[PDB]
Amino acid sequence: GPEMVRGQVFDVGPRYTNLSYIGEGAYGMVCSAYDNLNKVRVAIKKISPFEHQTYCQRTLREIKILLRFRHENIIGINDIIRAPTIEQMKDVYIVQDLMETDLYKLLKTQHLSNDHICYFLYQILRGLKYIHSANVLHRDLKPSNLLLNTTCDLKICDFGLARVADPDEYVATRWYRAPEIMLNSKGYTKSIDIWSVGCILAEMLSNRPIFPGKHYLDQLNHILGILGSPSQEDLNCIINLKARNYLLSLPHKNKVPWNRLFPNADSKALDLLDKMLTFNPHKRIEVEQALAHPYLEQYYDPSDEPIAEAPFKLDDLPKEKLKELIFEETARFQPGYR
Amino acid sequence: RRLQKGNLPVR
């Protein structure tokens, strides 16, 4: 009957066979599988969020955003599997392409030459420009959210924490968070993803998290320990979790020249690094300026860097209402459904 | 041009 995996149900229909456990992901575990229609081995993640308002929302986003987005650098949802009627749909399977590794695993045991870091950075920014032009924030860019196969192709994924941007809360892992957010505050500006990306670069250069820290004050001081104590217009700036009184009551910290920290890092990468990892969000480099930086000049081509066909535009409804929208949304992948 | 310039066998 329905194929089991690690004693767990994984009924994905006769379109996918040969299931192989790979690990965890979120509302459920993740498996590999052979697609009997495309003759490839897609990745399928089981999600069971119908009885959670948080999960339900994080799901709907991930499904709605990806389904509407189409970019070489933004992972795509190849298919979705759920019961014929919302009455039985107790879990959803989102089938996507199977990339070999990801930036987290790679950067951990693997070493990347400068040429690879430059290409990786570019693919990352090229994709970020699309999302950012879509009037959207990823809000969670990190090594483990950048997939890749041996060809060096990179794709951004997981938009369950994304958010719609525009001019005018429980956090796991903080290593890639800008100072303004620090310790539950959720970002609202594209400039936040830049800091994250900046942080991701730093890691590809040393294979080690640029801003570790027992807690947010320890991380905070780790930053200044590198970037040196910021100005007063920089502190008084978007830094106000109140506990900022901490930084205010803190001696002078000097900056560590990037070149010293990264003795084997190219001069161009560092200059751009610096531009991204700036305390004052307002001064952080934007995605378009970055794509045009001397470092990424061998790949730079604004005509090959498409924007969202249309920006992205009500989402705190009760779970059973989200399930409803999660049903309607997944209705296109059902047989003969136009 | 096109998606090129890269190679790295991994997990």
Side-chain angles (χ1 to χ4, degrees), chain A residues 1-26 28-312 314-337, chain B:
Chain A
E3 300 172 65
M4 291 285 269
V5 182
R6 295 298 221 279
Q8 286 293 179
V9 153
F10 216 86
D11 192 288
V12 301
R15 180 184 179 182
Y16 310 101
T17 61
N18 297 49
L19 304 170
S20 185
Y21 186 74
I22 82 172
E24 295 294 298
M29 53 176 72
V30 176
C31 282
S32 169
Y34 178 66
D35 177 354
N36 305 295
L37 193 63
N38 299 181
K39 308 192 193 65
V40 296
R41 286 186 62 61
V42 300
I44 311 178
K45 61 180 63 172
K46 181 180 176 174
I47 305 176
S48 306
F50 299 110
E51 48 217 303
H52 331 61
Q53 239 271 67
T54 293
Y55 288 61
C56 266
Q57 285 184 174
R58 192 163 63 178
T59 283
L60 201 178
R61 294 209 192 71
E62 165 80 354
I63 288 176
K64 185 67 176 190
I65 289 181
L66 295 176
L67 233 41
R68 178 177 298 173
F69 280 178
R70 60 284 123 53
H71 191 96
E72 306 183 39
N73 308 125
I74 307 187
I75 193 54
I77 284 183
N78 313 324
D79 168 64
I80 302 181
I81 297 183
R82 53 72 164 178
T85 29
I86 180 176
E87 296 95 302
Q88 307 86 291
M89 184 177 75
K90 294 293 181 180
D91 47 6
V92 165
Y93 304 79
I94 298 183
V95 181
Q96 307 185 323
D97 288 303
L98 191 59
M99 310 303 264
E100 267 301 57
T101 187
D102 60 63
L103 207 63
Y104 171 64
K105 298 171 186 170
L106 192 171
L107 289 179
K108 179 173 63 63
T109 72
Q110 246 59 41
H111 180 308
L112 296 180
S113 65
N114 184 199
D115 192 4
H116 289 109
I117 301 172
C118 171
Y119 185 52
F120 282 148
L121 183 57
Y122 175 74
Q123 295 197 67
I124 298 178
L125 291 169
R126 179 166 174 275
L128 181 68
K129 168 188 179 177
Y130 174 81
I131 304 171
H132 277 187
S133 73
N135 190 54
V136 168
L137 317 173
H138 184 287
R139 279 182 42 207
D140 195 40
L141 275 334
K142 54 180 176 186
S144 91
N145 264 332
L146 301 165
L147 316 182
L148 359 125
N149 21 58
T150 290
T151 61
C152 271
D153 285 337
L154 178 162
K155 290 189 177 183
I156 309 176
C157 59
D158 191 289
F159 292 72
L161 257 43
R163 178 63 288 185
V164 184
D166 53 55
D168 303 289
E169 214 306 66
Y170 151 57
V171 180
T173 303
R174 50 291 157 186
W175 292 337
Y176 313 85
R177 309 268 288 196
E180 72 250 43
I181 300 172
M182 292 300 282
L183 208 298
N184 314 171
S185 187
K186 259 56 193 301
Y188 49 167
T189 69
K190 295 170 185 175
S191 50
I192 71 170
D193 292 322
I194 313 305
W195 175 277
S196 299
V197 178
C199 283
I200 291 160
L201 193 192
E203 212 168 313
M204 288 188 282
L205 289 177
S206 57
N207 296 74
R208 285 162 291 187
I210 184 71
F211 303 131
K214 286 172 165 52
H215 46 269
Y216 88 113
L217 282 187
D218 180 51
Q219 191 191 306
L220 209 55
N221 188 301
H222 263 46
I223 303 178
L224 310 191
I226 291 181
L227 306 176
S229 296
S231 72
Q232 51 292 304
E233 68 179 307
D234 288 348
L235 306 187
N236 303 179
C237 193
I238 319 304
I239 295 67
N240 45 53
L241 208 300
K242 185 90 294 74
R244 75 146 185 168
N245 298 312
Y246 165 64
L247 308 179
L248 276 182
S249 67
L250 197 66
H252 175 271
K253 282 66 179 62
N254 314 68
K255 168 184 166 49
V256 171
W258 292 122
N259 83 91
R260 170 196 301 172
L261 238 169
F262 305 119
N264 298 291
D266 178 284
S267 297
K268 296 316 307 167
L270 298 177
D271 175 358
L272 184 51
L273 181 55
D274 200 66
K275 300 297 175 295
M276 291 188 243
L277 296 185
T278 71
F279 201 68
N280 197 313
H282 298 165
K283 305 192 186 73
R284 241 112 79 189
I285 186 169
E286 290 151 53
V287 76
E288 334 76 67
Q289 300 169 181
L291 278 165
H293 184 283
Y295 181 58
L296 299 172
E297 230 215 352
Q298 63 261 285
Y299 298 112
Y300 184 55
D301 171 11
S303 286
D304 200 35
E305 278 144 35
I307 48 180
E309 200 52 289
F312 203 104
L314 298 176
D315 191 65
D316 70 350
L317 308 69
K319 54 179 174 297
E320 302 99 322
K321 215 303 181 185
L322 298 168
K323 180 186 182 185
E324 175 209 319
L325 308 181
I326 285 183
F327 192 68
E328 204 166 307
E329 279 291 310
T330 57
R332 214 191 69 169
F333 286 103
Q334 297 296 59
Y337 253 36
Chain B
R1 278 288 65 185
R2 194 80 298 93
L3 189 55
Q4 279 295 304
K5 196 63 63 292
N7 283 301
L8 290 165
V10 286
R11 309 181 76 69

